[PDB]
Design a protein around this ligand. Structure first.
Ligand SMILES: *[IH]c1cn([C@@H]2O[C@H](CO)[C@@H](O)[C@H]2O)c2ncnc(N)c12
Length: 328
């Protein structure tokens, strides 16, 4: 049965919560336990109230993203197909209760400083159910780092890390992320010069440029194990395919074209589409502290431009990693 919030967020951990993000889904906080930052994602489920303008998921509707979270986290401990590029999952609980006042305090601070698009989550009753996911703290999202990265060399590392993680997940799980906008790419400092992955038994490395990338948010994702497919069936969603003002919204339409509106099928080209959207952000929206003012850096720039104009002719992230010149 469900647990109280205090099971997940004992006093000291609750007291250290600061809000770090949000979506229609709910709220994300950072806190600390055993000297280590963690992120806490809180999603209301099973109730009748609109939350941030949308109905709450049922337990059946939230289960896919929980299952996918777990499977992708477990890739850090696998052998033939191994990656640390998805967010580590520490725990998942079903919680019952009204929203903790200390979290409302945190929510108010964020609203006062950054502003929120969400409702203040102060209207839940003591029978309300939530899913609370505790993950690794992944750093800061790529969108928030628009003006904060060193150079396009950093961009190349980020694209290589993303492509490798997606390829490993394609190979192990027939995974498609399906919503890899730049809010879902997280960046954290690492002292490691090289990051490691293994793809179908072959290990390789990626120069880090001082950053470790984590992919988050599996609300639209798909994967399979032993022919049992876990996914979000958006075949009858209207609003998802009618966005404009950002290439992001075209990707939803391009996925629907690719899969003929059949979301249970495996179409790893969707991962290529998202990687193209991210490359497009790197070239058109990101601004770097140091420009390509040297010939070796002008060459990295040319290679990322070449990637942008050629990558849509590849079938999967696996195809890209193994065959594209950017990664040789
Ligand atoms: I899971 C997660 C989510 N965030 C932040 O919240 C936003 C909405 O999901 C994201 O765009 C991002 O800014 C996280 N930040 C750090 N670490 C984790 N695990 C996060």
């Amino acid at each position: 049965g469900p647990v109280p919030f205090s099971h997940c967020l004992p006093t000291e951990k609750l007291q250290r919560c600061e809000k770090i993000g949000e979506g229609v889904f709910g709220e994300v906080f950072q806190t600390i336990a055993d000297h280590t930052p963690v992120a806490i994602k809180i999603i209301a489920i099973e109730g009748p109230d609109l939350v941030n303008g949308s109905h709450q998921k049922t337990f059946e509707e939230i289960l896919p993203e929980i299952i996918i979270s777990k499977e992708l986290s477990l890739l850090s401990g696998e052998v033939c197909n191994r990656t640390e590029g998805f967010i580590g999952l520490n725990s998942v609980h079903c919680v019952q209760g009204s929203y903790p006042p200390l979290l409302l305090k945190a929510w108010d601070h964020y609203n006062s400083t950054k502003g929120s698009a969400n409702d203040r989550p102060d209207f839940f009753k003591d029978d309300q159910l939530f899913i609370v996911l505790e993950t690794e703290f992944g750093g800061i999202d790529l969108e928030q780092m628009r003006t904060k990265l060193s150079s396009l060399a950093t961009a190349k590392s980020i694209l290589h890390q993303l492509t490798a993680s997606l390829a490993v997940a394609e190979a192990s799980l027939r995974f498609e992320h399906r919503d890899l906008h730049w809010g879902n790419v997280l960046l954290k400092k690492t002292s490691l010069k090289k990051l490691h992955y293994t793809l179908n038994g072959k290990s390789s490395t990626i120069p880090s440029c001082g950053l470790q990338v984590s992919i988050i948010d599996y609300t639209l994702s798909r994967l399979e194990r032993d022919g049992i497919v876990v996914f979000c069936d958006v075949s009858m969603d209207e609003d998802l395919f009618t966005g404009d003002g950002d290439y992001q919204f075209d990707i939803y339409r391009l996925m629907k074209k690719e899969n003929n509106n059949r979301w249970g099928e495996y179409h790893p080209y969707s991962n290529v589409l998202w990687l193209h959207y991210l490359t497009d952000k790197m070239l058109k929206q990101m601004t770097f502290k140091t420009k390509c003012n040297t010939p070796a850096m002008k060459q990295i720039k040319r290679k990322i431009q070449e990637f942008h104009r050629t990558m849509l002719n590849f079938s999967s992230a696996t195809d890209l990693l193994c065959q594209h010149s950017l990664f040789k």
